[PDB]
Design a binder for these strands. Structure first.
Ligand SMILES: Nc1ncnc2c1ncn2[C@H]1C[C@H](O)[C@@H](COP(=O)(O)OP(=O)(O)OP(=O)(O)O)O1
Ligand SMILES: [Ca+2]
Ligand code: NA
Length: 430
DNA sequence: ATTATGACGCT
DNA sequence: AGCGTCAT
């Protein structure tokens, strides 16, 4: 009734760059603009592995994880850009620097949480209140929302995409009560106005287009963002949730894309998020645990409380390389040479991080995989990181893993290593 | 022979 | 601490 919280206290946005690594390469090389193209890493094995795909190329069926040779079979005119290689490995520096460009722009509007190399959540609650004051009861015109979709509209009693978008926007704006500064729907709408401005600034100042979701929490904001891509933003209101969720497969919701989500489906015998509402909180907790159960009970009603954390910088800085099939490392000299290569890239990134961000990492984590293990990581060990020195770091990494060597022979390594990983963690101010 | 990352939960 | 899950 009157005491039933509806999770409508906040305005949250999720901004996500469209086909990000592709746009980085297209900005740099105009010849790739408005073409079917993809970004690939390595080239020798089947033309390289695809990691990003332009919307033009997606129309031909090109996807991430596809080998470039296979992609070319779907799209013979596909253009490719290669990830830079340094010290024998893929080097993602260019995309990390492009990411900083975008994060710094977003930070002018509001506190952001960096969720990945190319996306950030934004808590717009306070910014919305401020904009609501400036407006002073004055209505919101559709002209302020030129790329916004209202999920669930139009509805009730044109055959083109932009026409439908506008019809829905009009129905929404027609319904708004702008006299009430505390209407959640009004708050979301002002949120969307601000996000239009954020997205315009990003495109103006970097050249990169993006999509966005605006809702009352991170999970709905993320879901919304994906509903109309590319180059559009979507508002998902509290009211839209029952219909949206009624046919939404459980796996589409962030965190339910894996084993937990499969267990929800299997154990409860359901398919869609909306079907969760018929279980009690205790019932959900009995199957999925206390935390997951409470989260599910609220989430299926469109309610989630996870905060947008004030964090614009990554918490760890890591360097990793696979050594698949035949290229697995089988000699001590091999293992030491590759630890040094990884340690050298890591040193370079850490030193840059220390100058830019006024902090120093204090722990080095070392992880390997051995041939045979289905798991991505076989063994992880940490040691002290006391100096930004590649030789020391690689020497230390070797010391903490050297006992993994089954080989009776000193020089040989067995079983061969199929992955190496160095990660700097536990930052302190400096 | 996807690969290179990165956050957070469990015990 | 070391491992697993989920994500981009
Ligand atoms: N599995 C992966 N392996 C390596 N790099 C990845 C992987 N997934 C994503 N990336 C990189 C390349 C992407 O351009 C970038 C952002 O990822 P993501 O947001 O999932 O897709 P995207 O930006 O390429 O397309 P979209 O327009 O659908 O968001 O991070
Ligand atoms: Ca993206
Ligand atoms: Na993303």
């Amino acid at each position: 009734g009157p005491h039933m919280a509806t999770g409508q206290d906040r305005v949250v946005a999720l901004v996500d760059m469209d086909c990000f690594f592709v746009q980085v390469e297209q900005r740099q090389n105009p010849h790739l603009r408005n073409k079917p193209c993809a970004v690939v890493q390595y080239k020798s094995w089947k033309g390289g592995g695809i990691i990003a795909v332009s919307y033009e190329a997606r129309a031909f069926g090109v996807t991430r994880s596809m080998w470039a040779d296979d992609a070319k079979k779907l799209c013979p005119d596909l253009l490719l850009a290669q990830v830079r290689e340094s010290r024998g490995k893929a080097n993602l520096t260019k995309y990390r620097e492009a990411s900083v460009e975008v994060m710094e722009i977003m930070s002018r509007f509001a506190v952001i949480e960096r969720a990945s190399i190319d996306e950030a959540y934004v808590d717009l609650t306070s910014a919305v209140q401020e904009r609501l004051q400036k407006l002073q009861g004055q209505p919101i015109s559709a002209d302020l929302l030129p790329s916004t979709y209202i999920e669930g509209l139009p509805q009730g009693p044109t055959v083109q995409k932009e026409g439908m978008r506008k019809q829905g926007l009009f129905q929404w704006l027609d319904s708004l009560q702008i006299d009430n500064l505390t209407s959640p729907d009004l708050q979301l709408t002002v949120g969307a106005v601000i996000v239009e401005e954020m997205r315009a600034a990003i495109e103006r100042e970097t050249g990169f287009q993006c999509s966005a979701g605006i809702s009352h929490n991170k999970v709905l904001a993320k879901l919304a963002c994906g509903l109309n891509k590319p180059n559009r933003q979507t508002l998902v209101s509290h009211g839209s949730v029952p219909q949206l969720f009624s046919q939404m497969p459980i796996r589409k919701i962030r965190s339910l894309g894996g084993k937990l989500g499969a267990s929800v489906i299997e154990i409860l015998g359901i398919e869609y998020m909306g079907e969760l509402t018929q279980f009690t909180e205790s019932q959900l907790q009995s199957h999925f645990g206390e935390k997951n159960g409470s989260w599910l009970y609220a989430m299926c009603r469109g309610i989630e409380h996870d905060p947008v954390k004030p964090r614009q910088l990554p918490k760890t800085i890591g360097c990793s390389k696979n050594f698949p099939g035949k290229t697995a490392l089988a000699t001590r000299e091999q293992v030491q040479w590759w630890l040094l290569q990884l340690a050298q890239e890591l040193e370079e990134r850490l030193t840059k991080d220390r100058n830019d961000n006024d902090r120093v990492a204090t722990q080095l984590v070392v992880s390997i995989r051995v041939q045979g293990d289905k798991r991505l990581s076989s063994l992880r060990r940490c040691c002290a990181l006391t100096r930004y020195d590649a030789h020391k770091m690689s020497h230390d990494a070797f010391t903490v893993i050297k006992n993994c060597n089954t080989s009776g022979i000193q020089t040989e390594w067995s079983p061969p290593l199929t992955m190496l990983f160095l990660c700097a963690t536990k930052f302190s101010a400096s």
